[PDB]
Amino acid sequence: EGVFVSNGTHWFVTQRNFYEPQIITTDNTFVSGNCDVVIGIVNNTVYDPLQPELDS
Amino acid sequence: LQIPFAMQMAYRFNGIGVTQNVLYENQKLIANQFNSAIGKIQDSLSSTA
Ligand SMILES: *[C@@H]1O[C@H](CO)[C@@H](O[C@@H]2O[C@H](CO)[C@@H](O)[C@H](O)[C@H]2NC(C)=O)[C@H](O)[C@H]1NC(C)=O
Numbered sequence: 888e889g890v891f892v893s894n895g896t897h898w899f900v901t902q903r904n905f906y907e908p909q910i911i912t913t914d915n916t917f918v919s920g921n922c923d924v925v926i927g928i929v930n931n932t933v934y935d936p937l938q939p940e941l942d943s
Numbered sequence: 944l945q946i947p948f949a950m951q952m953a954y955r956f957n958g959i960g961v962t963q964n965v966l967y968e969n970q971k972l973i974a975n976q977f978n979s980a981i982g983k984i985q986d987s988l989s990s991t992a
């Protein structure tokens with residue numbers, strides 16, 4: 888739920904009716920297929936909250 | 944509030960209980976079906992009394 892937005896330099900996801908930017912993560916989001924299909928997709932990092940623990 | 948039209952249609956798909964990747968993956972087909980369906984409105988009204 889929410890929409891991807893940028894302030895010009897950084898990418899966030901907000902709920903749609905009130906500006907509240909969240910850092911984009913694998914639990915803010917879901918995957919479907921690959922980048923070649925979608926008209927206007929943008930290149931970015933998605934943070935995975937498990938990776939700091941696997942970095943122990 | 945402006946929003947891109949394909950991104951508004953992705954909200955209309957969530958509103959019927961279809962996950963929005965279904966629109967972004969099928970976007971040209973969905974656009975052609977709409978454009979073709981509006982063409983059938985012209986041809987019906989430009990013919991039927
Ligand atoms: C876009 O939003 C980010 C919010 O993180 C801004 O970057 C932060 O800027 C403050 C100072 O304004 C710094 O203290 C933070 O460390 C920055 N965070 C990061 C991740 O670098 C960014 O300045 C905003 N851009 C514009 C054009 O407004």
Ligand SMILES: *[C@@H]1O[C@H](CO)[C@@H](O)[C@H](O)[C@H]1NC(C)=O
Binds near residue numbers: 927
């Ligand atoms: C958006 O419009 C610009 C011209 O205004 C065009 O160059 C660009 O390819 C378009 N991008 C998408 C995602 O449709």
Ligand SMILES: *[C@@H]1O[C@H](CO)[C@@H](O)[C@H](O)[C@H]1NC(C)=O
Binds near residue numbers: 930
């Ligand atoms: C996005 O990333 C891929 C892989 O790094 C690259 O091939 C592609 O050209 C990039 N696209 C844009 C719009 O930067």
